[PDB]
Each structure stands twice: as structure tokens, then as C-alpha cells.
Amino acid sequence: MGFKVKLEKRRNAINTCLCIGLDPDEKDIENFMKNEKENNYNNIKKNLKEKYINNVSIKKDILLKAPEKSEEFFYFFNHFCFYIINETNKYALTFKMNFAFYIPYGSVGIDVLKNVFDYLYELNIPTILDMKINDIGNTVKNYRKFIFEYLKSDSCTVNIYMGTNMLKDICYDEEKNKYYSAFVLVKTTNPDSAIFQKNLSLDNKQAYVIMAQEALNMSSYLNLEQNNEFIGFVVGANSYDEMNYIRTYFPNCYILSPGIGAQNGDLHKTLTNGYHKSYEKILINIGRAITKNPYPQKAAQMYYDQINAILKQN
Amino acid sequence: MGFKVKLEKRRNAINTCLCIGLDPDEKDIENFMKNEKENNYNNIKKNLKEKYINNVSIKKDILLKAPDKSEEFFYFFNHFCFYIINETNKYALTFKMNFAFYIPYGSVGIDVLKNVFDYLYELNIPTILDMKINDIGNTVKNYRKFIFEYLKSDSCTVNIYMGTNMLKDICYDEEKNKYYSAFVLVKTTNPDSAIFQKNLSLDNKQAYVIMAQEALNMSSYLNLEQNNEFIGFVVGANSYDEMNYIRTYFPNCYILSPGIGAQNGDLHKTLTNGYHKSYEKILINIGRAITKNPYPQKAAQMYYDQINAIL
Numbered sequence: 266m267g268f269k270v271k272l273e274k275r276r277n278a279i280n281t282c283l284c285i286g287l288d289p290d291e292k293d294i295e296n297f298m299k300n301e302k303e304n305n306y307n308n309i310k311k312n313l314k315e316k317y318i319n320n321v322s323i324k325k326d327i328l329l330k331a332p333e334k335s336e337e338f339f340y341f342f343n344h345f346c347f348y349i350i351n352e353t354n355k356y357a358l359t360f361k362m363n364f365a366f367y368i369p370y371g372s373v374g375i376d377v378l379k380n381v382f383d384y385l386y387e388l389n390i391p392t393i394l395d396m397k398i399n400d401i402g403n404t405v406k407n408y409r410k411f412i413f414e415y416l417k418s419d420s421c422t423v424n425i426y427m428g429t430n431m432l433k434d435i436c437y438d439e440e441k442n443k444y445y446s447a448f449v450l451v452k453t454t455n456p457d458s459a460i461f462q463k464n465l466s467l468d469n470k471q472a473y474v475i476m477a478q479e480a481l482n483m484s485s486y487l488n489l490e491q492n493n494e495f496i497g498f499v500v501g502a503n504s505y506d507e508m509n510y511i512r513t514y515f516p517n518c519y520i521l522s523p524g525i526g527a528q529n530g531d532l533h534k535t536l537t538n539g540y541h542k543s544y545e546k547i548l549i550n551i552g553r554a555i556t557k558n559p560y561p562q563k564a565a566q567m568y569y570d571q572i573n574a575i576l577k578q579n
Numbered sequence: 580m581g582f583k584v585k586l587e588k589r590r591n592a593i594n595t596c597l598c599i600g601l602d603p604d605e606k607d608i609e610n611f612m613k614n615e616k617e618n619n620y621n622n623i624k625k626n627l628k629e630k631y632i633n634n635v636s637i638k639k640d641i642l643l644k645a646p647d648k649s650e651e652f653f654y655f656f657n658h659f660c661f662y663i664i665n666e667t668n669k670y671a672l673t674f675k676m677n678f679a680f681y682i683p684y685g686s687v688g689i690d691v692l693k694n695v696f697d698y699l700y701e702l703n704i705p706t707i708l709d710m711k712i713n714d715i716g717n718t719v720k721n722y723r724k725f726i727f728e729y730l731k732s733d734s735c736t737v738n739i740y741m742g743t744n745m746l747k748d749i750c751y752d753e754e755k756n757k758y759y760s761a762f763v764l765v766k767t768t769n770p771d772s773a774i775f776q777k778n779l780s781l782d783n784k785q786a787y788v789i790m791a792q793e794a795l796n797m798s799s800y801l802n803l804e805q806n807n808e809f810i811g812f813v814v815g816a817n818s819y820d821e822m823n824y825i826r827t828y829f830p831n832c833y834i835l836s837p838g839i840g841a842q843n844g845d846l847h848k849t850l851t852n853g854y855h856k857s858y859e860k861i862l863i864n865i866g867r868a869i870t871k872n873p874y875p876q877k878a879a880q881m882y883y884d885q886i887n888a889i890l
């Protein structure tokens with residue numbers, strides 16, 4: 266229907282802006298495999314009872330077999346992702362998945378990535394692919410096809426330092442007359458992100474302000490928000506004094522904020538600075554704090570309740 | 580094994596700085612399949628006669644089949660890349676392959692990319708993966724493993740706008756005590772690349788300059804060049820005023836320059852601005868002008884001879 270409408274519907278459904286990050290590393294997979302075998306696959310057996318696992322399109326036969334040795338890594342990697350989604354999805358307004366974690370093993374991880382997006386799409390849960398794509402317009406069309414046609418993602422992240430015009434070939438497809446949403450990197454959770462995003466300037470404005478400004482110019486040029494799509498901003502949770510300014514200077518803009526949890530922020534200051542009455546425009550991404558926690562559903566609910574309490578106090 | 584030594588060794592062997600870009604699109608694959616079907620698989624049959632094709636590690640049971648299905652697209656895509664490598668590798672100092680062209684179909688294209696790097700690695704031809712990676716240090720280690728451990732690439736491209744420190748987790752691996760090379764995006768061939776790389780500045784030095792300096796400071800901090808690795812710059816062929824500034828201000832730097840051919844540059848002016856006696860420090864990337872040309876070897880030789888004349 267459009268990412269804007271889809272986000273706004275689900276926010277009424279579950280009343281949160283929590284964005285769960287699903288970034289499984291190699292140690293998450295082996296710990297999951299060892300724990301399932303020592304506990305008689307209690308989580309995997311629960312996955313196979315879930316409805317939508319019968320609708321994934323890649324190696325469905327292998328995935329539904331009860332515990333083909335070369336497929337062992339594919340099996341537990343994919344089932345670990347189902348486990349996290351099954352355990353925590355009721356608290357998630359959005360799921361964000363970083364492309365880097367699904368490529369380091371070659372094609373096998375892309376098949377897992379495809380199944381994860383198929384799974385979330387049948388749950389009708391909004392998705393974000395954190396791929397931070399950037400290239401010339403001819404080349405970036407390949408990224409658009411992978412993100413929005415193959416995976417059927419709702420959105421992705423973009424690094425427009427090479428030029429804002431790349432958004433014309435990411436957020437718009439003239440041949441299908443289709444519109445897509447994206448989050449451009451504005452201020453990032455790197456400790457040394459300032460050297461370029463702060464200390465560079467044009468007309469006594471810091472680079473992140475000018476980059477956010479240029480991003481919205483492209484958004485209006487492509488008429489995304491008339492098609493219920495948008496171009497948003499990635500603003501790190503630790504950047505409290507740029508967050509305010511983004512919300513103040515650009516009201517009604519969508520912000521994706523990572524850095525709470527594994528990178529050690531303060532949730533109240535982040536959410537209040539980026540707050541908006543439509544709080545789907547202030548997505549709080551929490552990944553490793555949930556996915557590496559021993560009781561993931563318990564962890565998701567903890568951050569779910571904390572976010573709602575800070576919303577009420579707004 | 581070091582990238583600096585590998586580049587300079589091969590440069591003496593074939594005496595060129597041509598970088599052949601292998602960016603096959605959807606129509607390159609369909610056209611290759613169509614012509615192979617019309618002409619009794621003459622190029623695919625030539626690919627299977629090569630000794631080194633046995634060195635690919637993914638689905639060799641399909642790749643080495645006589646030409647004959649769900650595996651049909653994978654087969655012709657993979658063989659098209661081998662076809663180009665077989666036709667043109669004698670003129671290439673390095674091969675650069677842009678990750679974007681290998682992902683849009685899902686995992687199948689990554690299998691081709693792996694086999695392509697396997698093929699080039701056994702031919703001992705230097706490789707570049709044009710992926711322009713950028714992320715936090717924890718995340719980018721995954722790119723380093725995919726690029727330098729899985730594909731065994733010699734180098735890749737990086738966008739350090741998120742912070743120079745990501746190079747610490749790309750060009751160096753503390754657990755293995757291994758060093759890798761990279762090319763940082765400095766000035767790009769976008770028509771509107773100026774909006775950020777030119778008009779942004781610190782104390783009236785343009786953003787690309789401060790990014791280039793910050794890139795080499797990181798290279799010196801990691802002691803890359805004593806481990807026969809380096810950090811280089813991506814400087815567009817059309818940017819003659821910055822190409823010359825980089826060559827003078829950073830005299831011994833490695834430069835990777837794309838944009839000649841399909842993006843309508845002038846080879847003489849680009850190469851002269853960035854020239855260095857060790858001309859492996861000025862790689863000229865040519866992609867579509869060769870891969871989309873009807874006679875790829877003839878086009879590669881055309882640019883090879885043209886580059887050699889400019890010296």
C-alpha cells in the first residue's frame with residue numbers, strides 16, 4: 266500500500282516504535298546449534314509449528330526436516346533467524362537486517378536472507394535492509410532490484426556521499442512506475458564520524474545538515490510522499506544534539522536511530538529528542554542487546570515497555 | 580603475496596596499467612546465451628578447454644557440463660565471465676568486479692562471483708572488488724571476511740564518509756596478523772559528485788582532499804606499505820583538476836580511475852595527469868567499452884595499445 270501507510274497501521278496495532286535488528290554472527294549460529302542439540306531442538310520444533318515457515322521459497326525441504334551434512338550450517342542459521350522473529354516479533358514495529366552479516370559465507374547466507382524477508386513479508390511486518398548502498402545511477406539499479414524486487418523489502422539505507430542523484434535510481438523505477446523508501450546516512454554512531462559529518466561545512470552549516478537538506482530536495486523531486494514513500498534519516502542514538510536539530514529543523518521527517526544497547530546509549534534522551542506524535546518516525550533499533558540475550562522474548566518486552574513509558578511521558 | 584609486489588611483478592610482465600572491468604548486466608547474459616545457442620556454443624566450448632576452469636569451487640558439476648533447466652541462467656552467466664577473462668586477460672594488469680552486478684538475482688550471482696575470483700586467483704591476476712563498503716567496525720569485519728578470505732580478493736573499494744577508523748577493520752586482521760589493500764572513494768564520476776566532495780570544505784580545503792589525507796594517515800598508522808599493502812584513491816577520469824592535485828600532493832599514491840569509455844572521457848588527459856613511473860599506481864578502468872563491445876579482445880587490445888602509446 267506504501268511504506269508510510271504500512272508503518273502507520275502497525276503502529277496503531279502494537280503501539281511502539283521498537284525496531285528489532287537481526288544481525289546474526291558466526292558465534293550466534295554455533296551457540297544456537299549447540300543449545301538446540303543439548304535441549305532437544307525445543308526452539309526448532311516450535312519453528313516448524315509456525316504457519317509461515319511452509320511459505321519460504323528456498324530449500325523448504327531441508328528447512329522442515331527434523332534433525333545432508335553440508336546443509337547443516339544453512340539449517341541452523343536459517344532456524345536461528347526464525348527463532349528470533351518467532352520469539353520477538355510481537356514487540357517489533359519494524360525488523361532491520363544488516364546485509365553484511367548475510368554475505369560473509371557466500372551464497373548460502375543470501376538464501377537465508379531471502380527466506381528471512383519472505384518470512385517477515387508473510388507476517389506483514391515492515392522491513393529495513395541495512396545495506397548502505399552507494400554507486401553511480403546505472404549500477405545502483407542492481408541494488409534496487411535486489412532490495413525491492415527480490416527481497417521485497419519495504420526500505421533500505423543509503424550513503425549519498427557520492428551524490429544525491431543516486432536516489433532517483435533507488436527510490437524510483439520509471440519502467441514499473443514504482444516508488445520506494447530509503448534512509449540516508451546523516452549522523453552515524455561511529456566514534457569518529459564527526460571528521461566528515463561535523464567538521465566539513467558549506468555556508469557555515471555542518472555536512473550532516475546539508476546532506477539531510479539535499480536528501481529532502483530529492484524526495485520532493487521524485488514525489489515520494491505523494492506515493493506514500495519517503496526518504497528518511499539515519500541518526501545515531503548517541504548524537505543527542507544533532508537529533509533535536511533534525512526534528513526541529515525538519516519536522517515530520519522519518520528517523521532511523523541505531524546505537525541503543527550494544528553501543529551503550531540512554532534511551533530516554535534519544536526518544537524524547539527524536540519524538541514525534543507519529544512515533545513511527547523515530548524508530549529505535551535494538552539488535553545485539555536482544556539477539557544475543559539468553560531469553561530474547563524477555564529482552565524484547567523489556568525494551569518494548571521502556572519505549573512505551575517514554576512515549577507516554579511525551 | 581603482497582598486493583604491491585603482485586601489481587609490480589605483473590606490470591613488468593605485460594607493461595600496462597589497464598584495469599578491465601567485468602560488470603555483466605542482465606542483457607549481457609541473455610545476449611551471450613542467444614549467440615551461443617545460434618552458433619553451436621563455440622565460446623562455451625572454448626571455455627571448457629582451458630585448464631584452469633577446473634579451479635572453480637562452486638557447482639563445477641554444472642559448469643563443466645556440455646551445453647544443455649533451473650541451472651541454465653547460472654551456467655551462461657558464469658561462462659560469459661570466463662569468456663571475457665579468457666579473451667582479454669593478456670592485456671589486463673588487474674580485473675575489477677563490481678559487487679552490485681552479482682547480487683540482484685539472489686545467491687546464484689554470488690556463486691558466479693566466487694567462481695570468477697577463484698578463476699582469476701588461479702590465473703594469478705590481481706583483483707579488485709568494487710563494493711564501496713561502509714559500516715561500523717563490528718559490522719565491516721564481515722565484509723573483510725567475505726572480500727579477502729572467501730573471495731581471496733587482492734583489494735576492494737571503501738566509502739569512509741562514516742569514519743576513517745573502518746579501515747582498521749578492513750585493511751588489517753588482528754586475529755590472523757594479515758594486511759589487505761583498499762581504494763577509498765575520493766572523487767567520483769557522478770555528474771553531481773561535486774555537491775559533497777567539492778563544495779564541502781574544512782578551512783577552505785575541499786572534502787575530497789581532507790578525505791584523501793585522512794585515508795593515507797590511516798594507511799601510515801597501520802603500517803600497510805611495509806606489509807606490501809596500501810590504501811589508494813578512487814579518482815574519476817573526468818576530474819582532471821583533482822587528478823593532478825592528488826598526483827602532486829600525494830606523489831607515490833596508488834590511484835584507481837574509472838569513467839573512460841562508457842562515461843565518455845579522454846584517456847590521454849586522464850592518464851597524463853595521474854602518471855607515475857610505477858604506472859600500476861594509475862589504474863585505468865575500462866568496463867562496458869570492452870565487455871559490451873562485439874569483439875572484446877580487439878577492444879581490450881585497442882585500449883592496451885592506446886595506453887602504451889601514452890608513455
Ligand SMILES: O=c1ccn([C@@H]2O[C@H](COP(=O)(O)O)[C@@H](O)[C@H]2O)c(=O)[nH]1
Binds near residue numbers: 453454525550715
Ligand atoms: O550509524 C549507524 C548506521 C547503521 N548501524 C547498524 O545498525 C546495527 C546496530 O545493531 P546493534 O548495535 O544494536 O547490535 C548494525 O547492523 C549496524 O551496522 C549502526 O550501528 N550505526
Ligand SMILES: O=c1ccn([C@@H]2O[C@H](COP(=O)(O)O)[C@@H](O)[C@H]2O)c(=O)[nH]1
Binds near residue numbers: 401866
Ligand atoms: O566514481 C566512480 C566509482 C566507481 N565506478 C565503477 O566503475 C565501473 C564503471 O566502468 P564502465 O563500465 O563505465 O566502463 C562500474 O563498476 C562503476 O560502479 C564508476 O564508474 N565511477
